[PDB]
Amino acid sequence: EHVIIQAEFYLNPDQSGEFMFDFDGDEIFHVDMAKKETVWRLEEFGRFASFEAQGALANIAVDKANLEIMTKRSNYTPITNVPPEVTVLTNSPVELREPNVLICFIDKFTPPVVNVTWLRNGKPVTTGVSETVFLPREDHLFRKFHYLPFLPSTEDVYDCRVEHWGLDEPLLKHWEFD
Amino acid sequence: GWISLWKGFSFDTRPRFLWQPKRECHFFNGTERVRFLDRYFYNQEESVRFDSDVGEFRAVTELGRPDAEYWNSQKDILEQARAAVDTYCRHNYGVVESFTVQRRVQPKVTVYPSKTQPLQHHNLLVCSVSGFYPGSIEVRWFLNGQEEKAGMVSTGLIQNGDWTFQTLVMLETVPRSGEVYTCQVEHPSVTSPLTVEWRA
Ligand SMILES: *[C@@H]1O[C@H](CO[C@@H]2O[C@@H](C)[C@@H](O)[C@@H](O)[C@@H]2O)[C@@H](O)[C@H](O[C@@H]2O[C@@H](C)[C@@H](O)[C@@H](O)[C@@H]2O)[C@H]1NC(C)=O
Numbered sequence A: 001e002h003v004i005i006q007a008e009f010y011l012n013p014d015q016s017g018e019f020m021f022d023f024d025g026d027e028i029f030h031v032d033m034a035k036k037e038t039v040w041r042l043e044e045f046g047r048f049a050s051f052e053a054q055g056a057l058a059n060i061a062v063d064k065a066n067l068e069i070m071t072k073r074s075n076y077t078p079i080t081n082v083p084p085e086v087t088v089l090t091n092s093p094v095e096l097r098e099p100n101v102l103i104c105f106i107d108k109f110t111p112p113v114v115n116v117t118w119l120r121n122g123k124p125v126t127t128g129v130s131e132t133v134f135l136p137r138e139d140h141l142f143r144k145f146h147y148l149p150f151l152p153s154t155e156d157v158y159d160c161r162v163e164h165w166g167l168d169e170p171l172l173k174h175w176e177f178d
Numbered sequence B: 001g002w003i004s005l006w007k008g009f010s011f012d013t014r015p016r017f018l019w020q021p022k023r024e025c026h027f028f029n030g031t032e033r034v035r036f037l038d039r040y041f042y043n044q045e046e047s048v049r050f051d052s053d054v055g056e057f058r059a060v061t062e063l064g065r066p067d068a069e070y071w072n073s074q075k076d077i078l079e080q081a082r083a084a085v086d087t088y089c090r091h092n093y094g095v096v097e098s099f100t101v102q103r104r105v106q107p108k109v110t111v112y113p114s115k116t117q118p119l120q121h122h123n124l125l126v127c128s129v130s131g132f133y134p135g136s137i138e139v140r141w142f143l144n145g146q147e148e149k150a151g152m153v154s155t156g157l158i159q160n161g162d163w164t165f166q167t168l169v170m171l172e173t174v175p176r177s178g179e180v181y182t183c184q185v186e187h188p189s190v191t192s193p194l195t196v197e198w199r200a
């Protein structure tokens, strides 16, 4: 029993579009719209399969034209914001001075527009951080993961700060060694 | 192989408008039984759907009613959709099967005491199971050959987003000397169960 999902979206007025394949909840690849490029979630995947990113660029164009038809047909009914719920966890049990990874899991939100910042002791961090694209859910909200490799210690505390139009205030989820 | 996409068919406080195509391929017993769905979502609301088990397009809301009727009248569009289980689902299955259906990553299992709150003596044994794939897993606690079934809390299956999973299963217990606790893990990456013992 397995499920493969081709999930796309186009968002107005932001003019944002994404295209990705999902296998049992994990991302196989997405298409970098700017770079016209297929980006495999694990590098090894590209050594076993291929995808023409041009086709995804063409699908996004059709998605845009379909969106504008349906926007007019709905008399410009807008989407209801649904704010995310945010969880910060580690890749594995945390041991001091042993490298680990902080995961910021942003879940159950729409539209797929979010601002995410890692904070160490209140200061924004951008070194080594990575992120996924907007992943699908069965209830058609979105998921997203942000990652921050870190060296655990008693001195550093961490926050994942998440901004979304459905939120009144920035959502900060704390992490510290216990 | 080359993954083929499904092309589909044609129909700050300022408002947003969102279009979400979803092309689903559901596989049962490999590609023995396959189900294809072509789903179109406007602002999180499904408008029109093709379900291969139905054989024709159906409007989920009134917003999709024109396109379901028009697409159902087109012989060529309809036969493209009814063929998708073969031209699309079964094709992509053969392309990705070796590194998706067959992917197996072994869990790392560790046991350590913990505390529910600031207390003096540990009142939790934690079985940490991390880094495994796929997500199907069973974690059981044993106390000297007797399976402890009461007093357990689990995080549930945690998806790390990087093709690995994680789970923690806490056993509520103040360990007594001479007690041997066993965490047992069953996962398709190993042929036998995994066991990790902890002693007070
Ligand atoms: C979009 O508005 C269409 C007309 O504008 C309004 O007309 C009525 C409802 C009134 O409120 C007036 O002040 C507005 O200008 C309206 O016709 C359309 O309804 C849809 O199309 C009609 C022809 C019917 O099929 C009806 O069942 C539909 O809902 C409005 N669209 C929607 C999606 O509601």
Ligand SMILES: *[C@@H]1O[C@H](CO)[C@@H](O)[C@H](O)[C@H]1NC(C)=O
Residues within 6 Å of the ligand: A113, A114, A115, A163, A164, A165, B012
């Ligand atoms: C993200 O930050 C930019 C810059 O201020 C802002 O324009 C945008 O609205 C923000 N998005 C949110 C808060 O969802």
